[PDB]
Amino acid sequence: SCCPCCPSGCTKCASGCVCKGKTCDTSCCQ
Ligand SMILES: [Cd+2]
Ligand SMILES: [Cd+2]
Ligand SMILES: [Cd+2]
Ligand SMILES: [Cd+2]
Incomplete structure (x- = not known):
């Protein structure tokens, strides 16, 4: 795993x- 804020x-x-x-938005992974 990596982070519980992203899929496996x-x-x-x-x-x-x-x-x-940053958190995890369109400017992160979205
Ligand atoms: Cd991650
Ligand atoms: Cd994440
Ligand atoms: Cd991610
Ligand atoms: Cd992210």
């Missing part, structure tokens, strides 16, 4: 976790 995948978090920046 998220190509965005696949490289790590882009959620380290």
